[PDB]
Design a protein around this ligand. Structure first.
Ligand code: NA
Length: 226
């Protein structure tokens, strides 16, 4: 019944970060009538004190790791919710590869470019402490590649660096930022990295802002309820 959609915090004022996650949880809410859905950012002190032992946590994270396995359970157990169930993260959501494909196909159609003749670039944060985020982004690119000319990845934290990965690509290219929130996306400053690369293609909004994301999260919540 109780569901909390949790975002990683980012530097700056936590109030607009909290409002963004509340706005997302409000779009999820009418799609899961059997549950009480609310949003929280870990940048806000007391983010998790509304959670209890019967609350489900939908983490807006790109992969599983030390945070999902040890940190988030510690930050919940202290808050009074040790038995709170953590669902698979946004990055491992079964609907994410189809969502990326629909956004890229829609984008190619607006440009008047055939998808088979378009080069794809999946831009993601990656990680310096785990191999899980880059393996997940490569799985996305490898799933998109059969529908396009080619698909590769570029990262902020690890090689291949986005400034290198976006270099020497054609004009008919689309970059999809594989980010769950606008706050995490803006921090990485993809426009500066793509400018250094001389990227000439189309740069889409981050995947976490797509219109189908609330329905995707709702289906993952519904599947975890009994
Ligand atoms: Na299509």
């Amino acid at each position: 019944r109780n569901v909390l959609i949790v975002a990683h915090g980012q530097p700056g004022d936590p109030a607009p970060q909290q409002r963004a996650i509340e706005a997302l949880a409000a779009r999820v809410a009418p799609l899961v009538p059997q549950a009480c859905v609310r949003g929280a950012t870990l940048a806000m002190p007391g983010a998790l004190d509304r959670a209890d032992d019967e609350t489900l946590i939908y983490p807006l994270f790109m992969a599983t790791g030390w945070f999902t396995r040890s940190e988030l359970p510690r930050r919940l157990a202290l808050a009074g919710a040790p038995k709170a169930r953590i669902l698979p993260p946004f990055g491992s959501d079964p609907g994410l590869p189809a969502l990326c494909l629909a956004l890229i196909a829609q984008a190619a159609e607006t440009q008047g470019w055939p998808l088979a003749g378009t080069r794809l670039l999946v831009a993601a944060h990656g990680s310096g402490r785990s191999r899980a985020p880059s393996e997940a982004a490569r799985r996305i690119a490898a799933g998109l590649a059969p529908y396009a000319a080619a698909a590769t990845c570029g990262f902020i934290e690890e090689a291949p660096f986005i400034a290198d990965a976006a270099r020497d690509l054609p004009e008919r290219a689309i970059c999809l930022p594989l980010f769950a929130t606008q706050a995490e996306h803006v921090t990485d400053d993809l426009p500066a990295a793509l400018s250094q690369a001389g990227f000439q293609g189309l740069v889409l909004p981050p995947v976490g802002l797509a219109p189908q994301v609330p329905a995707m999260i709702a289906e993952s919540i519904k599947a975890a309820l009994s």
